[PDB]
């Protein structure tokens, strides 16, 4: 699918104690490329992958300044929301923000988004048209009236249609050899007995990128999806991902089951079996 640039902000109040902490991470597709964390002294926006390191000092200065000012805004925001909900000043709360753009075939914004959450729940979000907001509750409706009167949606739209996509197309170039390379998973099937009438067959997918993948089991061409164990896709540690799908079968029917792996890194979808 289409490439995307996205940022994820987490602000956490520390009462008090008596300030916040603010963390930002930036991704291109499933690859983290920058981070900011004012838990560190003299905080700076910093590179998290080789290909971004080549940005000049002015970029890093501008990004740093920008996020530090954003951190201040979220510090104030936490105080404001505590007020909206008439909550105790002694408790810590979270304000999360999620925004990004997707690149279309014409090199323009395919679609963009901006979503915010308070204490882990939807608070306010920009609608698909990038021109109106959806408030989750009465408190968010106060924020909404402020953002409507302030032209926040129009600034967001211009960013998403402008700087966001422009930056994305740039990063995609800089990190060509890695961002635009599909890394197929290395696969195999393992067997793990249990009692006499149970045997776990596990289909592995290792070191793949991007994150999107399909692992399914079939019993003579019939899907076995409902008794299948599917783990959450997990980071390999090197920028790639891992995943596996297991299912218990009769200790003799091993040959009667097939694992099917679909990943854009493959030439053809795979069909694995236990040997």
């Amino acid at each position: 699918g289409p490439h995307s640039l996205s940022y994820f902000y987490t602000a956490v109040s520390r009462p008090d104690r008596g300030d916040s902490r603010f963390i930002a991470v930036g991704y291109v597709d499933d690859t983290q490329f920058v981070r900011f964390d004012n838990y560190a002294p003299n905080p700076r926006m910093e590179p998290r992958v080789p290909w971004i390191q080549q940005e000049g000092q002015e970029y890093w200065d501008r990004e740093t300044r920008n996020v530090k000012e954003t951190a201040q805004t979220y510090g104030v925001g936490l105080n404001t929301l505590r007020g909206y909900y008439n909550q105790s000043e002694a408790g810590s709360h979270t304000l999360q923000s999620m925004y990004g753009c997707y690149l279309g075939p014409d090199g323009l914004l395919l679609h963009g988004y901006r979503q915010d959450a308070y204490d882990g729940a939807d608070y306010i979000a920009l609608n698909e048209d990038l021109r109106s907001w959806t408030a989750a509750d009465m408190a968010a409706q106060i924020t909404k009236r402020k953002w409507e009167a302030a032209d926040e949606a129009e600034r967001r739209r211009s960013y998403l249609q402008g700087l966001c996509v422009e930056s994305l197309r740039r990063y995609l170039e800089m990190g060509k050899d890695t961002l635009q390379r599909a890394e197929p998973p290395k696969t195999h099937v393992t067997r793990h007995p249990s009692s006499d009438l149970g045997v776990t067959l596990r289909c592995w997918a290792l070191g793949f990128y991007p994150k999107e993948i399909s692992l399914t089991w079939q019993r003579e061409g019939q899907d076995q999806s409902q008794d299948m164990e599917l783990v959450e896709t997990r980071p390999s540690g090197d920028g790639t991902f891992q995943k596996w799908a297991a299912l218990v079968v009769p200790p003799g029917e091993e040959q009667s089951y097939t694992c099917h792996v679909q990943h854009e890194g493959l030439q053809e979808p795979l069909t694995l079996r236990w040997d």
Partner: peptide, 9 residues
């Protein structure tokens, strides 16, 4: 590149 600070909540 990051967006500028959002409006106040």
């Amino acid at each position: 590149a990051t967006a500028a600070a959002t409006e106040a909540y």
